[PDB]
Amino acid sequence: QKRAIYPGTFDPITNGHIDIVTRATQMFDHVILAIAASPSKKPMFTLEERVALAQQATAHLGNVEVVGFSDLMANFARNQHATVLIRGLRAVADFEYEMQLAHMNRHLMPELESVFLMPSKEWSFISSSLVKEVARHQGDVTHFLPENVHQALMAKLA
Amino acid sequence: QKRAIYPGTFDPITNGHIDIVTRATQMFDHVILAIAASPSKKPMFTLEERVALAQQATAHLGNVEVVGFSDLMANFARNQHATVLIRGLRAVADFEYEMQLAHMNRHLMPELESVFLMPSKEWSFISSSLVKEVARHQGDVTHFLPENVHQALMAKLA
Amino acid sequence: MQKRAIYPGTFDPITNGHIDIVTRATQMFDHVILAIAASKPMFTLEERVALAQQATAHLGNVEVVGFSDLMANFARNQHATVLIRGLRAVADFEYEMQLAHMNRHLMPELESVFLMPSKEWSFISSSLVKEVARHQGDVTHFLPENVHQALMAKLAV
Amino acid sequence: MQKRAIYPGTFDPITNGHIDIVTRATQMFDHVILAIAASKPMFTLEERVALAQQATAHLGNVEVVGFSDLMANFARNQHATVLIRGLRAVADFEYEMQLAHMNRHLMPELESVFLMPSKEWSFISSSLVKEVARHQGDVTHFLPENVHQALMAKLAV
Amino acid sequence: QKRAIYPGTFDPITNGHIDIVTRATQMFDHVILAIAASPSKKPMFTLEERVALAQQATAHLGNVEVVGFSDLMANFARNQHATVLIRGLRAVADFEYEMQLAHMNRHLMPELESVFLMPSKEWSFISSSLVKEVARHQGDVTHFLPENVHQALMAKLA
Amino acid sequence: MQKRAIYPGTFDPITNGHIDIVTRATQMFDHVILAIAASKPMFTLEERVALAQQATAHLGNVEVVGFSDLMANFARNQHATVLIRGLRAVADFEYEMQLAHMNRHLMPELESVFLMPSKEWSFISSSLVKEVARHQGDVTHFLPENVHQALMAKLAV
Ligand SMILES: COc1ccc2[nH]c(C)cc2c1
Ligand SMILES: COc1ccc2[nH]c(C)cc2c1
Ligand SMILES: COc1ccc2[nH]c(C)cc2c1
Ligand SMILES: COc1ccc2[nH]c(C)cc2c1
Ligand SMILES: COc1ccc2[nH]c(C)cc2c1
Ligand SMILES: COc1ccc2[nH]c(C)cc2c1
């Protein structure tokens, strides 16, 4: 049983995130989608909201477990008995900061291997931040979000 | 009549912005310099201030129209009957975020073509943020701003 | 208000990415010159011109021409005031900025405009397509039908 | 749950950076094929395979094989569903993203996975090592002992 | 007597900073480690705290002088009679912003030459921000900080 | 307190960007060696040295020398403790970081220092200048007078 963790702020989870976690489940026996509380980022949705949205959005994937956490990433991964940490790679600025995080996590937990997946071309130019920005100005983001997430984002901004 | 829109926060408009809008007017019949309210960015100048500064700074360009807006970019462009969106390209981090915005705008308004211009070497290393930072510490920024803007920035910080 | 734009490249061979860019250019400017450089291409200049002409024949305001001068020199003699460049990724951007500053030095009245291809074509180039096809990979999706036929014939011999 | 992964490259010659990557891969996947491309290398394909075999003999689930097809074609015929790529810096990232989208077009069932080397090996490549050694620089730290011996012999003649 | 200035926010000073300033002292007769007040960055440590930490962390380097400042960088460098400004280069996003700052400083003080040093591989993936983030979640950062700084960071977060 | 710095490159030919960098170096360090690598240049090593000498003769503390060893080996034998590199754009930065870590491995006592050229020269290189000039573009602004004369003569034949 190979266990992988897919951590992030997921504020909110997008179709880009869904693509990454789906490809993770095709590679590893069990995938933990781990939502960081991230108070420093002032998330639009609470951790409880983000967990519920991701749970509904991944219910069709049998080997996904959605969990919220505030611990240090490396500690949470060890405590989940994960040996693989999944991250999606979008742009150069993401890549460089991801290298930093990966080298720090390797110092904290050497047996946790960071692996990067590339999203579909369809999602390679979207982010949670960009979708929220469009929605803040009432633009149509139905294409970029799971149905349940779109409703919740519309409701939140209403 | 080809109509182009040059959107941005313009907080405040710099000589780099003046260079871009000038080259836009040499290419398209009518250029709308569109100032986004951008409350999330906490602009130093109000939208009304930024519009007045840009109006004075572009008065010598006959086919520039300065307008403020809070709508979604794509909607404002459609409502202005613009089919070209101008953006200046400065650095790598700008380029990647501009690609995101352009692909999102293309989803929202497919007939709005995003085109990028390269500023003069003189302005390729300045930004509104950098000029404000120098001025906050009382450094001489006369070279980087239109006369009216420099006065207003000096007055604002006084 | 009648702008002449030039879209230069080697187009060895022209891809759907090039077709995307030139199509966007024709919706923006009155006349677009698709300019094919004479200089070790897989296809000859005459082949590259003929392929590009057939692939753009449906665009009424495209003119396909070959050139061997410095691009700026040809643009000047063609009375172009707009230079079309497609931007795919960071790597192009950095090299295109260099070329844009050189071209502005050589011909100040030629404005470089950077267009963005569809996500569908943002990761391809003529060189990658040729390499994949040379090594028995499927590139049908990335090329006009006429180019695909010509590429298969070229690789068969 | 028994994943077959392929780690392709020219490995001319295999470095400690490659050893780092393939070692990480073997801790993640059941079987890893270290696939050496036939195509102007300093070492012949037979030399490169023998060097890589000796340098990975301690890894029980590594299989070193040569191939001359398109990488995706070989991966398909090997029933690999995971493609291992090492990421050193921004420059690789940009080119690897291109290749990853092409490989997904060619073989959708092959997932590209990017691994990160130790800081120790993040700035080296086979080409840089060869260039330094060719010009009388010390590269002992960057190579397996067997490769170091073979490189010295090659440069002596 | 060649005088160099190594400016930054140093919130807090890391082993990466120590590496850079050490290599600066091997190249120039006198190095001023200059700590910017940086109120816009909301530093975790006060300027007085950051100065004291850096002073203790560099006490073994005889030709380092630690000073705090709120002036414009170029003015402070001129007033220190420095003709070399040291900056460490970590990642692409740093590099581009450093080019901006260097070209602005060259406009403000042409005789102040900006020079960039590359940190050891050991520190090329750490930053003050990343260390603080790990420590906020109680992760072990002993490896990345001078002893006195680690204690102060532990105490601050306690 | 008497630092010896080396500024290595191919300088084929030396440009105003190189002159900018070496001038900045001489204002920082006591002695600067402009080191020209022997290795398919447009100008011979003897031409490149003579061109660089004339273009820097006004700088009293510059020494122009040719070398064929590994750059680090030559720097060691010259008792240089400072390595001068010019940084133009992101692309250089990424490759220079690689080289800097290799050079630190080869000669730990050689510190790499990166200088920034004027905005005027931030987009040029010897290769771009040669390519533009080869294709009948004006490069007078980017070169010392003596180099411009020599480049015209070289391209005439
Ligand atoms: C739970 O939230 C976080 C947020 C940022 C984080 N960075 C690292 C290294 C661990 C971590 C955990
Ligand atoms: C008027 O202000 C804005 C600010 C950011 C924006 N992003 C997009 C896609 C549209 C928009 C409008
Ligand atoms: C960016 O400007 C240029 C300069 C020279 C060029 N040659 C070709 C074939 C395309 C091109 C574009
Ligand atoms: C990223 O995918 C590829 C494609 C072709 C390839 N050839 C070799 C030798 C390695 C490789 C990797
Ligand atoms: C003392 O603090 C600062 C902070 C940012 C700064 N930028 C520039 C150009 C000078 C300066 C000084
Ligand atoms: C960055 O370090 C190096 C290494 C080898 C080098 N060769 C030449 C001609 C310049 C140079 C610089």
H/E element, A36 = strand A30-36
Give the whole-angstrom CA distance, residue D87 versus residue A137: 38
- Are E22 and E7 within 8 A, CB to CB? no
Q: What one-letter code names the amino acid at B144?
A: F
What was the elucidation method? Answer: X-ray
Residue identified by tokens 């199509």 is: C23
Residue identified by tokens 């295999």 is: D14
**Residue E121, min C-alpha distance to chain D (Å):** 6
- Are E110 and F20 within 8 A, CB to CB? no
Neighbours of F1 (CB within 10 A): 7
- Are D60 and D91 within 8 A, CB to CB? no
Give the whole-angstrom CA distance, residue B97 versus residue A127: 11
SS3 B45: coil
DSSP A127: -
- Are D88 and D125 within 8 A, CB to CB? yes
Q: What one-letter code names the amino acid at F51?
A: L
Q: Crossing angle for the helix pair C45-56 and C145-156, nearest 10 degrees? A: 150
Question: Which one is catalytic: E78, E90, E106, E114?
Answer: E90
DSSP one-letter string for chain E? --EEEEEE--TT--HHHHHHHHHHHTTSSEEEEEEE--GGG--SS-HHHHHHHHHHHHTT-TTEEEEEE-S-HHHHHHHTT--EEEEE--SHHHHHHHHHHHHHHHHH-TT-EEEEEPPPGGGTT--HHHHHHHHHTT---GGGS-HHHHHHHHHHH-
**DSSP β-bridge partners for residue D32:** D5, D62
Helix extents (H) in F45-121: 45-56, 71-77, 90-106
Residue identified by tokens 């720090």 is: A104
Q: Crossing angle for the helix pair E128-136 and A92-108, nearest 10 degrees? A: 50
Q: In total, how many domains does chain C have?
A: 1
DSSP F133: H
SS3 C49: helix
A66: tokens are: 């959605």
Burial tier of F91 (Cβ tally within 10 Å: 0-12, 13-18, 19+): middle
Burial tier of E80 (Cβ tally within 10 Å: 0-12, 13-18, 19+): middle
B152 φψ region: left (φ > 0), alpha (ψ -120 to 50), beta (else): alpha
Give the whole-angstrom CA distance, residue C120 versus residue C117: 8
D95: tokens are: 């080119």
**Beta carbons within 8 Å of D142's beta carbon, 6+ residues apart:** D15, D16, D17, D121, D124, D129
- Are E46 and E136 within 8 A, CB to CB? no
- Ligand 5 pocket check for E145: Cβ under 6 Å: no
Give the whole-angstrom CA distance, residue F68 versus residue A28: 53
- Ligand 2 pocket check for B76: Cβ under 6 Å: no
Resolution in A: 2.0
Is position E128 annotated as part of the catalytic site? yes
- Are A23 and A117 within 8 A, CB to CB? yes
DSSP one-letter string for A39-107? GGG--SS-HHHHHHHHHHHHTT-TTEEEEEE-S-HHHHHHHTT--EEEEE--SHHHHHHHHHHHHHHHH
Is position E42 annotated as part of the catalytic site? no
SS3 B10: coil
SS3 F74: helix
Give the whole-angstrom CA distance, residue E63 versus residue E25: 7
Domain with residue E12: its CATH number is 3.40.50.620
**Counting atoms of ligand 4 from 1, which one is nearest the CA of D39?**
9
A143: tokens are: 């294409």
- Are C72 and C112 within 8 A, CB to CB? no
Mark yes or no for CB contact E27/F3 under 8 Å: yes
DSSP one-letter string for chain D? ---EEEEEE--TT--HHHHHHHHHHHTTSSEEEEEEE----SS-HHHHHHHHHHHHTT-TTEEEEEE-S-HHHHHHHTT--EEEEE--SHHHHHHHHHHHHHHHHH-TT-EEEEE---GGGTT--HHHHHHHHHTT---GGGS-HHHHHHHHHHHH-
Q: Which of A6, A40, A73, A107 is the best mutation target for the ligand 1 pocket, counting ligand atoms within 8 Å of the beta carbon and taking the most? A: A73
- Are A4 and A84 within 8 A, CB to CB? yes
> What is the radius of gyration, based on Cα positions, of chain B?
15
B34 φψ region: left (φ > 0), alpha (ψ -120 to 50), beta (else): beta
Provide the Cα torsion E44, E46, E49, E54; round to 10°: 70
CA distances from C103 to C72, C100, F70, F124, F137 (A): 6, 5, 36, 11, 10
CA distances from C137 to C129, D37, D67, D70, D73 (A): 9, 16, 15, 7, 8
Q: Are strands F111-115 and E113-117 parallel, antiparallel or unpaired?
A: antiparallel
**Beta carbons within 8 Å of A155's beta carbon, 6+ residues apart:** none
Neighbours of F38 (CB within 10 A): 12
Closest by CA to C7, choosing from C55, C70, C75, is C75
- Torsion sign over Cα C132, C136, C140, C143: positive
Closest by CA to B125, choosing from B100, B94, B154, B146, is B94
Neighbours of B8 (CB within 10 A): 20
SS3 B69: strand
CA distances from A5 to A69, B153, C50, E119 (A): 12, 49, 53, 32
Q: Residues, chain C, total? A: 157
Mutate to test the interface with B, among A125, A132, A136, A143 (most CBs of B within 10 A): A125
Give the whole-angstrom CA distance, residue A108 versus residue A110: 6
Burial tier of B109 (Cβ tally within 10 Å: 0-12, 13-18, 19+): buried
- Ligand 4 pocket check for D15: Cβ under 6 Å: no
- Are A73 and A7 within 8 A, CB to CB? yes
Q: Rounded to 5 degrees, what are φ and ψ at A117?
A: -115, 150
Give the whole-angstrom CA distance, residue A46 versus residue A28: 29
- Are D13 and D49 within 8 A, CB to CB? no
Which residues in chain C belong to E strands, given as ranges?
4-9, 31-37, 62-67, 82-86, 111-115
Residue identified by tokens 């959605």 is: A66
Is position A41 annotated as part of the catalytic site? yes
Give the whole-angstrom CA distance, residue A155 versus residue B16: 40
- Are A21 and A58 within 8 A, CB to CB? yes
Largest CA distance in chain F: 49
Q: Residues, chain F, total? A: 157
Q: Crossing angle for the helix pair C90-106 and F90-106, nearest 10 degrees? A: 110
A81 φψ region: left (φ > 0), alpha (ψ -120 to 50), beta (else): left
Neighbours of D40 (CB within 10 A): 4
Provide the Cα torsion E119, E123, E127, E130; round to 10°: 160
**Beta carbons within 8 Å of B3's beta carbon, 6+ residues apart:** B28, B29, B30, B31, B32, B80, B81, B82, B83, B84
**Beta carbons within 8 Å of A22's beta carbon, 6+ residues apart:** A61
Q: What one-letter code names the amino acid at E145?
A: L
- Are A96 and A114 within 8 A, CB to CB? no
Q: Rounded to 5 degrees, what are φ and ψ at A83?
A: -120, 0
Q: Kindly report the protein residue whose alpha carbon is nearest to atom 12 of ligand 4.
A: D8
SS3 C111: strand
- Are D26 and D59 within 8 A, CB to CB? yes
CA distances from E96 to A93, B131, D157, F90, F149 (A): 12, 16, 45, 7, 35
**C8 upstream amide cis, omega within 30 of 0:** no
DSSP C6: E
* Interrupted backbone of chain D, residues before each interruption (C–N > 2.5 Å): 39
Provide the Cα torsion F67, F69, F71, F74; round to 10°: -70
Query: Could you list the active site residues of B?
Result: 17, 41, 90, 128
Q: What one-letter code names the amino acid at F49?
A: V
Give the whole-angstrom CA distance, residue C89 versus residue A91: 10
Give the whole-angstrom CA distance, residue A84 versus residue A76: 12
Mark yes or no for CB contact F120/B122 under 8 Å: no
**Beta carbons within 8 Å of C65's beta carbon, 6+ residues apart:** C33, C34, C35, C36, C49, C78
Give the whole-angstrom CA distance, residue C57 versus residue C22: 12
Burial tier of C10 (Cβ tally within 10 Å: 0-12, 13-18, 19+): middle
DSSP A146: -
Q: Pick out the residues of the known binding site of F for ATP.
A: 7-11, 18, 86-88, 96, 121-127
The side-by-side arrangement of strands in the sheet containing B3-8 is B64-69, B30-36, B3-8, B84-88, B113-117, C111-115, C82-86, C4-9, C31-37, C62-67
Helix extents (H) in chain B: 15-25, 47-58, 73-79, 92-108, 128-136, 147-157
Give the whole-angstrom CA distance, residue B53 versus residue B66: 10
Give the whole-angstrom CA distance, residue A8 versus residue B158: 43
- Are E142 and E150 within 8 A, CB to CB? yes
Q: What one-letter code names the amino acid at D131?
A: E
The side-by-side arrangement of strands in the sheet containing E84-88 is E64-69, E30-36, E3-8, E84-88, E113-117, F111-115, F82-86, F4-9, F31-37, F62-67
For chain B, how are helix, strand and coil distributed in percent, rounded to 5? 50, 20, 35
Parent domain of B141:
1-158
Give the whole-angstrom CA distance, residue D16 versus residue D52: 11
Give the whole-angstrom CA distance, residue F157 versus residue F149: 13
Neighbors of chain E by Cβ distance (3+ pairs < 8 Å):
A, B, D, F
Burial tier of E141 (Cβ tally within 10 Å: 0-12, 13-18, 19+): buried
SS3 F52: helix
For chain B, which residues lie within 8 Å of any Cβ of chain E, measuring from their own Cβ?
A: 91-93, 125-127, 130, 134, 136-140, 143
- Are B116 and B105 within 8 A, CB to CB? no
Give the whole-angstrom CA distance, residue F78 versus residue F76: 5
